[PDB]
Design a protein around this ligand. Sequence first.
Ligand SMILES: Nc1nc2c(ncn2[C@@H]2O[C@H](COP(=O)(O)OP(=O)(O)NP(=O)(O)O)[C@@H](O)[C@H]2O)c(=O)[nH]1
Ligand SMILES: [Ca+2]
Ligand SMILES: [Ca+2]
Ligand SMILES: [Mg+2]
Ligand SMILES: [Mg+2]
Length: 164
Amino acid sequence: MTEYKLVVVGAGGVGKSALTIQLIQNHFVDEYDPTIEDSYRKQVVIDGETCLLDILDTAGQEEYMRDQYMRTGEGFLCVFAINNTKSFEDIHQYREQIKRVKDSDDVPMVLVGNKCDLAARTVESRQAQDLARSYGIPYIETSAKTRQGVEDAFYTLVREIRQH
Ligand SMILES: Nc1nc2c(ncn2[C@@H]2O[C@H](COP(=O)(O)OP(=O)(O)NP(=O)(O)O)[C@@H](O)[C@H]2O)c(=O)[nH]1
Ligand SMILES: [Ca+2]
Ligand SMILES: [Ca+2]
Ligand SMILES: [Mg+2]
Ligand SMILES: [Mg+2]
């Protein structure tokens, strides 16, 4: 019935779970409970096509078998937070991991700068645009808190999988 397997990766606390929960359940998770590995499914219409999204929400905390879960992914949301410079610097490492698990240099991906509602910005849009350009992928900013950009980020990833 047309299924897209999406995987959300990135450093601990950047908002991977909050983003996914906003997309699927339409509310903001205010508390921080570190994830091990969670799965969500939802039927949606994207550009006139009824499809099923299967979303894997992965651990960002080193302490919390991710590789095995990521293997099945068709597209990856690589998330950092715009007030967390280290999370941005670590994007390179997540992308390298994706390329290992997929054994390919051509994997559908979108770069996401989350927490754009916050004002303590240390990653400027232009820096992230440049990183995304070097990877040949789109950059999109989101806020799981306000819901701004959330649907756009996930639907953009579906549109990247369709170009593969
Ligand atoms: N202001 C604001 N807070 C956010 C946003 N997204 C997430 N948060 C907050 O940041 C904290 C961590 O969010 P969470 O979604 O659990 O992060 P995670 O990337 O899933 N963490 P982990 O890798 O450990 O599972 C929570 O307190 C959450 O409310 C956002 O867009 N804006
Ligand atoms: Ca809440
Ligand atoms: Ca491999
Ligand atoms: Mg989480
Ligand atoms: Mg600077």
